[PDB]
Amino acid sequence: ATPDFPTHFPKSSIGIENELAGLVVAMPANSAQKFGYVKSAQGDALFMLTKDMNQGSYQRPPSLQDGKNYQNWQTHTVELVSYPCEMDDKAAVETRKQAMLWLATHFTTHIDQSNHQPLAPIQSEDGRFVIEITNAKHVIAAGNGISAESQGQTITMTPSGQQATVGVAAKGFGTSATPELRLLESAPWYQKSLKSQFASLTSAENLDDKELAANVFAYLTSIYLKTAELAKKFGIYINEWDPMSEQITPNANGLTDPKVKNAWEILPRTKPSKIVEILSKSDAKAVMKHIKPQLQSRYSESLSKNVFQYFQDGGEVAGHGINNATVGDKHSPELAILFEFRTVPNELQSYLPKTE
Ligand SMILES: Nc1ncnc2c1ncn2[C@@H]1O[C@H](COP(=O)(O)OP(=O)(O)O)[C@@H](O)[C@H]1O
Ligand SMILES: [Mn+2]
Ligand SMILES: [Mn+2]
Asked: Coiled-coil intervals in this record?
C-alpha cells in the first residue's frame, strides 16, 4: 500500500506534481490512482507513481500477446506526485527532484527492453532510490502505448506538465509575514483591501481577535466573490443557481473544469468552511454575517445566496480538498490551508526537476 501524505509540518510546506512525457501506464478500468512509490534507501517516501490523464482504452499489441487478460484496461499518462516536505528543507526538495530525474532515466531503459511490462520493485544502481510497487496489475508502454516497440524516447518532464502545492498556517493568510505568504497574497482573486474594510465595519463590536477576524473575512470574501465571478463568466451551476436564468450559456463542466481551475491561477485546495475553526464562535459569527452583503452589492440575490450557502455547508472550491493538513506544534496543531499553482511561477521553479 502507498503511504498516505504526512499531514503535519512545523512551518510552510510544499508538494509537486510532475506529468511525464514519452510513455503511458495501462491498468484495469476503475483501478486506484496509485500503482507505486519511490522512497530513499533510508526509508523516506519521496513521490507516488500515479495514473493521470485518460488516453483511451488499452489494446495489447498482437506481437506481445502473452495469454494474460487485459480486458477493459485503460491507458493513462503518468504523473509523479511528491510527498510534501518543509519549504525550507533544501535536502528534501533536492532528493525529490533527483529521485524524479533518476526514475525518468529508469523509465527510458524500461520502455527500451521491457516495453508493455509492469515496473519492477528495484533499488537504483547508486543505491539512493527504491521503487515500491503497490499495484502489480499495470504495464508501462512507450509513447501512447499502441505500438509494441518504442521510438527510442527519452522520458522527460516539462513546465507545462508541472504543478506545485503550497501549504501555510491559515492564521498567516493576510499577514504578509513570509515570502510564501506574500506570494499567495499576490493571487489575482485575493483582495487585501477587504482587511481594512472589515475593520471599518466592526468598530462597535468587541471582537476576541480583530486582526485574525479581518484576515479570515478578506480570505473567505475573496473566494466567495471569485466563485461568483467564475460562475457568471463560465456559466457554472452552483447549488441551486441556474446560469441560464441570467441569460448565461454554460461554457464549463463545473467548478472542477480545468479552465475554471486555471482561471484561479493560485487554486485554493482546502474547504473554505475549515478556516472558521481558527476563530472563536463569536468572531466566526461576526465574519460570516458581513460576507453576504459583499456578494449582494456585486451579484444577484440568487447567485449571492447560492454561493454563500454552498461554502457555508462545506462546499469545495474545485472538488475534494486537502482538509486534514496541519502546521505548527505537533501536540497543538493549527489548520493549514493549501494552494495549487496551476503554472509554476519563477519563485517556485527551484522546487521542480528539470530534464534539461
Ligand atoms: N501537507 C501538504 N503540504 C503541501 N503539499 C501537500 C500536502 N499534502 C499533499 N500535498 C501535495 O498536494 C498534491 C496533491 O496531489 P494529488 O493527490 O494528485 O491531487 P489532485 O488530484 O487534486 O491533483 C501533491 O503534489 C502533494 O505533494
Ligand atoms: Mn494530480
Ligand atoms: Mn493538480
From this structure: none
Resolution number, Å: 2.5
Residues within 6 Å of ligand 1 by CB: 5, 7, 13-17, 81-82, 84, 165, 167, 322, 325, 338
Domains within the chain, CATH numbers bracketed: 1-186+324-356 (no CATH), 187-323 (1.10.3680.20)
Q: Are 106 and 154 in contact (CB under 8 A)?
A: no
Q: Which of 276, 271, 281 minimizes the C-alpha distance to 321?
A: 271
Q: What's the first-to-final CA gap in the chain, in angstroms?
A: 33
Sorted by sequence, the CB contacts under 8 Å of residue 258 that are 6+ apart come out as none
Strands 23-27 and 13-21: unpaired
Structure determination technique employed: X-ray
Q: Give the Cα-Cα-Cα angle 101, 103, 104 (nearest 5 degrees).
A: 65
d(CA 235, CA 212): 34
Short-list 200, 209, 175, CA closest to 290: 200
Q: Position 132: which residue type?
A: E
Task: State how far the alpha carbon of 108 is from the alpha carbons of 47, 94, 143, 200, in Å.
Answer: 18, 21, 11, 61
Cα 170-180-5 angle, rounded to 5 deg: 65
Distance 127 CA to ligand 2 centre (A): 28
